[PDB]
Amino acid sequence: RFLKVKNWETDVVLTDTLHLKSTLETGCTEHICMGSIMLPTKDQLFPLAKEFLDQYYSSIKRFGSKAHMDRLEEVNKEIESTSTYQLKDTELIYGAKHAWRNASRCVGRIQWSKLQVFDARDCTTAHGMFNYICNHVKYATNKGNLRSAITIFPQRTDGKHDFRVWNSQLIRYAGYKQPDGSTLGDPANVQFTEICIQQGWKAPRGRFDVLPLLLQANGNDPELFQIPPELVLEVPIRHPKFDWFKDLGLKWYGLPAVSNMLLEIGGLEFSACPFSGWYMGTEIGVRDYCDNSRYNILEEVAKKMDLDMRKTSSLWKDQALVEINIAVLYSFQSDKVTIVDHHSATESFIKHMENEYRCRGGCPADWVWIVPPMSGSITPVFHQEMLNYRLTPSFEYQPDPWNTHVW
Amino acid sequence: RFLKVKNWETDVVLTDTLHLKSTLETGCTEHICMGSIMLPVRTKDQLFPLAKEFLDQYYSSIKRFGSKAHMDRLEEVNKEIESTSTYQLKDTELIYGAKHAWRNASRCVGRIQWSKLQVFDARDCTTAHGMFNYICNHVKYATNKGNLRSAITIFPQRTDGKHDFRVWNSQLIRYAGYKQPDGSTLGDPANVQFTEICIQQGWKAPRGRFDVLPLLLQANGNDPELFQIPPELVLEVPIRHPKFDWFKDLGLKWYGLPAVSNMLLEIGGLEFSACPFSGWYMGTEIGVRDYCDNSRYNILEEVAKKMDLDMRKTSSLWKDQALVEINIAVLYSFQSDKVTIVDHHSATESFIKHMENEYRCRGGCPADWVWIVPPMSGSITPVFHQEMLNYRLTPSFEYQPDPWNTHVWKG
Numbered sequence A: 001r002f003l004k005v006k007n008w009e010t011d012v013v014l015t016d017t018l019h020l021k022s023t024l025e026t027g028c029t030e031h032i033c034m035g036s037i038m039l040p041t042k043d044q045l046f047p048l049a050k051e052f053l054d055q056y057y058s059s060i061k062r063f064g065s066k067a068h069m070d071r072l073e074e075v076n077k078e079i080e081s082t083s084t085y086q087l088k089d090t091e092l093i094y095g096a097k098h099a100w101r102n103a104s105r106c107v108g109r110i111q112w113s114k115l116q117v118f119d120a121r122d123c124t125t126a127h128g129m130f131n132y133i134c135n136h137v138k139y140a141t142n143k144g145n146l147r148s149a150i151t152i153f154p155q156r157t158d159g160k161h162d163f164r165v166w167n168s169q170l171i172r173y174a175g176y177k178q179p180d181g182s183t184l185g186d187p188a189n190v191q192f193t194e195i196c197i198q199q200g201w202k203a204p205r206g207r208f209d210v211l212p213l214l215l216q217a218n219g220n221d222p223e224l225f226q227i228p229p230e231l232v233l234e235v236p237i238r239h240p241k242f243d244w245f246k247d248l249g250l251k252w253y254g255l256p257a258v259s260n261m262l263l264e265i266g267g268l269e270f271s272a273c274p275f276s277g278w279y280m281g282t283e284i285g286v287r288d289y290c291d292n293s294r295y296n297i298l299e300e301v302a303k304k305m306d307l308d309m310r311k312t313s314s315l316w317k318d319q320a321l322v323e324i325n326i327a328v329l330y331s332f333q334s335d336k337v338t339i340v341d342h343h344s345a346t347e348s349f350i351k352h353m354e355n356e357y358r359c360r361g362g363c364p365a366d367w368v369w370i371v372p373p374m375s376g377s378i379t380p381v382f383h384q385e386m387l388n389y390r391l392t393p394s395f396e397y398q399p400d401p402w403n404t405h406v407w
Numbered sequence B: 001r002f003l004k005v006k007n008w009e010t011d012v013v014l015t016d017t018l019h020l021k022s023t024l025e026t027g028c029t030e031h032i033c034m035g036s037i038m039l040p041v042r043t044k045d046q047l048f049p050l051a052k053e054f055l056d057q058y059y060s061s062i063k064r065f066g067s068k069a070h071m072d073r074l075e076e077v078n079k080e081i082e083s084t085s086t087y088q089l090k091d092t093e094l095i096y097g098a099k100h101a102w103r104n105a106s107r108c109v110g111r112i113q114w115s116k117l118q119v120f121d122a123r124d125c126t127t128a129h130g131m132f133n134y135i136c137n138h139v140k141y142a143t144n145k146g147n148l149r150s151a152i153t154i155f156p157q158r159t160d161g162k163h164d165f166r167v168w169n170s171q172l173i174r175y176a177g178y179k180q181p182d183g184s185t186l187g188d189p190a191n192v193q194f195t196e197i198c199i200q201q202g203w204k205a206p207r208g209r210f211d212v213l214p215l216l217l218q219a220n221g222n223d224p225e226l227f228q229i230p231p232e233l234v235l236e237v238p239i240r241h242p243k244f245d246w247f248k249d250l251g252l253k254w255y256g257l258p259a260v261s262n263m264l265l266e267i268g269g270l271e272f273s274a275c276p277f278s279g280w281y282m283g284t285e286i287g288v289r290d291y292c293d294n295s296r297y298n299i300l301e302e303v304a305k306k307m308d309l310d311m312r313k314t315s316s317l318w319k320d321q322a323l324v325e326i327n328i329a330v331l332y333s334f335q336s337d338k339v340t341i342v343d344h345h346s347a348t349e350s351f352i353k354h355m356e357n358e359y360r361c362r363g364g365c366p367a368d369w370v371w372i373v374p375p376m377s378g379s380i381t382p383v384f385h386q387e388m389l390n391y392r393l394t395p396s397f398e399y400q401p402d403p404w405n406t407h408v409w410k411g
């Protein structure tokens, strides 16, 4: 019932007790591990609210105090009469910070307590949503000196009036299928780009076209808005040694901003809660640029490097991979846009895990996601045992609304 | 029931039914995943069912399930168990069993090869000297002058657990490690404890950076004995780089034959506590782990120094750069000397084809993603993008505790 995790590089053993507080299910059983699988009423609501408020009052060293008991009663009364309840601002901020703290797939959680929460629960329209999101984008970007932020739209009610951002991230590039049979731009965004056009968007029809926002307020049909281009900070990619690298015509955006998740706090569900931090360089250089089903640029780069592409054992892909990632980091750094390399980020996470173990009795972590997609074992996280379990408040994946919405 | 796995690169979806034959536990539960934890005498009572389940699988594989030969073998084994409290495997069942423990090894990326395995039956062995001779022959056969052949040598099974055969070495061939009084390590820091034991047992240590360790062998629960593998049987590769002429002067080499000797082979409930097996290396094991782990040879700095990389900040990716060059050198060196090796691209691509085939012909292929994904360039291999299901099938290879921790010294 008390569990040990060992770091095999340092021999340091940590004891996890925080898992016993875990409630939700992993997908694994005693017979089968699903560690590598990507997607593994008033009666229900009060236990959830109470569990949350208890941990909140505990956190402010007021557990079992009159103010604690009184807020539990107030929330109980409100659930009983209205079928739901409203979080206090203090509770919302606390909840949002803890959802991040609990995100077992996030390597950047050393930062979890520095999160600017924008309360958008008074929002009623998609134009209103657009305004809130522009303000988030501008605040978070901060002229390249990025600041972590979340904007929280109104909570789910009957489920027929959901707020949703249809984009998977606030800022992404369009993808287009060609008569050629090839894909122009980001192949990940083909379906979404089509939905945008089908709603009226006029695609510039290039390789790096920032997508419009498709915002759904109050369960209405979603509406298109272009983010002011001056608010979208992008970085041209060049290499510190390779003159020709700029000729590839590569750029990326500075602000990673996930907009498709569901924030659960005290049993309440926030279906539109875009949040943003700053990039670890491998997400762009390894995944966005080099996944075969993404921009898939390895071949092009390897050729400009004049590497021997005849055999896999020359490690031409691996050489080109490093150079691409060097460029990404150099480019952001030169343009003073916050980025973190995978060495620095994973070192920080180990330090964070140690803090969490001593101050909280553990840190839920998903090794499969935490270990970077390149150079795994030369980062300290590769050698660190991690226990994965689900705590609330939480961010959860939710299905694309276009499958769910009725027009 | 059916469980689906998806490949996020191809959208190919597979369906697992094989997991229903899994009995043993993972370490995980509905509330916790222990996917990244490295380590998450039987009664007649437990033994006959284990035997029966194995014999049922063996007879099905030969298309003789329910035959008289099947039924007679069940009765024979049953009678053997009730009378002697154990039983002996037929040679055919042993071979089948060892091949299947490999097929079932969820952490092994090389399983496309599983049905090609030379099995050396060493169940008539009685002494450490005899173990030494069997292991020499395995090494020579498997090495085959650089054209490596997969092999396993199987010593007598456990009886009362007081008479175990054990190879004390974790691999048949490994280099010594020596802690210096100033706290530095000479040779392989992973082998310091075992080297100290060897020296205590009477080994005269050369005290260099790549001293092949002697074998320490335990027969029939007796105190283990030291033997030096004839050096002419130990194939080694000096590591050089195709473009970098200074790489040779780092003085690196490695041995050609990876031969795991510390695992326990379970077949039909019988336990083979000494079952050394070997195949050939995937390059990254040497170039990434053995050379570049901080707790192993740890060569990254010196390599990057010699490459004149900017080492003042991690974001130059100097470590990543040196890492690729080192792994180029290992592959180049093995290939140039005609010693079998496989790169991580080829091995992972072969594993995906193996896995798809296993799903089609067998109903699944248990795989441990944490181990299958190579320790460099992860997502540029197809396994990174492949969902996997991890579960335990028997026959199996299991980790066992190091024998120096458990051994009753007779003196």
Ligand code: HEM
Pocket (backbone or CB within 6 Å): A100, A103, A105, A106, A107, A108, A109, A111, A115, A148, A149, A150, A258, A261, A275, A276, A277, A278, A279, A280, A283, A340, A345, A369, A395, A397
């Ligand atoms: C401040 C800098 C941050 C860094 C460097 C960082 C790093 C990362 C990385 C590398 C991933 C894996 C992403 C992927 O491979 O798709 C991730 C996942 C995630 N992070 Fe962070 N993070 C940061 C901030 C944040 C913030 C501000 C939040 C929420 C408030 C957050 C919550 C999450 C969640 C929920 C996931 C899993 C996303 C999913 O399932 O797709 N992170 N983080």
Ligand code: HEM
Pocket (backbone or CB within 6 Å): B098, B102, B105, B107, B108, B109, B110, B111, B113, B117, B150, B151, B152, B263, B277, B278, B279, B280, B281, B282, B285, B342, B347, B371, B397, B399
């Ligand atoms: C034929 C060429 C082979 C290749 C390229 C190969 C590749 C590998 C690699 C890279 C690993 C992970 C090793 C590590 O990181 O420590 C591994 C693990 C393993 N393999 Fe293989 N393998 C091969 C043959 C074999 C054979 C012949 C057997 C047994 C008959 C075997 C059984 C195992 C087992 C039991 C593990 C897990 C070891 C442990 O838990 O320490 N493999 N394989």
Ligand SMILES: Cc1cc(N)nc(C[C@@H]2CNC[C@@H]2OCCN[C@H](C)Cc2cccc(F)c2)c1
Pocket (backbone or CB within 6 Å): A038, A039, A169, A256, A257, A258, A275, A276, A277, A278, A279, A280, A283, A397
């Ligand atoms: C099937 C599926 C499940 C799931 N939980 N997430 C995804 C999204 C998949 C998972 N990795 C690729 C894709 O996400 C891209 C989003 N990554 C962002 C930019 C991470 C990030 C980084 C820094 C700061 C942040 F705030 C957020 C897909």
Ligand SMILES: Cc1cc(N)nc(C[C@@H]2CNC[C@@H]2OCCN[C@H](C)Cc2cccc(F)c2)c1
Pocket (backbone or CB within 6 Å): B038, B039, B258, B259, B260, B277, B278, B279, B280, B281, B282, B285, B399
């Ligand atoms: C705590 C622990 C548990 C466990 N199950 N194995 C280990 C052994 C750990 C796991 N990775 C580092 C150390 O293995 C070194 C052995 N690797 C061999 C060479 C694999 C191999 C490769 C090719 C062909 C083969 F037959 C065998 C440690």
Ligand SMILES: C[C@H](O)[C@H](O)[C@H]1CNc2nc(N)[nH]c(=O)c2N1
Pocket (backbone or CB within 6 Å): A035, A036, A037, A038, A368, A369, A370, B008, B384, B385, B386, B387, B388
């Ligand atoms: C199938 C496998 O789970 C999948 O490819 C995962 C592996 N690890 C990952 N890790 C991160 N950080 N992001 C990802 O998208 C993935 N994809």
Ligand SMILES: C[C@H](O)[C@H](O)[C@H]1CNc2nc(N)[nH]c(=O)c2N1
Pocket (backbone or CB within 6 Å): A008, A382, A383, A384, A385, A386, B035, B036, B037, B038, B370, B371, B372
């Ligand atoms: C903590 C973690 O489980 C451990 O470092 C694992 C990760 N993956 C691995 N994968 C392989 N092939 N070999 C290993 O030794 C390890 N070590």
Ligand SMILES: [Zn+2]
Pocket (backbone or CB within 6 Å): A028, A032, A033, A034, A035, B028, B032, B033, B034, B035
């Ligand atoms: Zn699991």
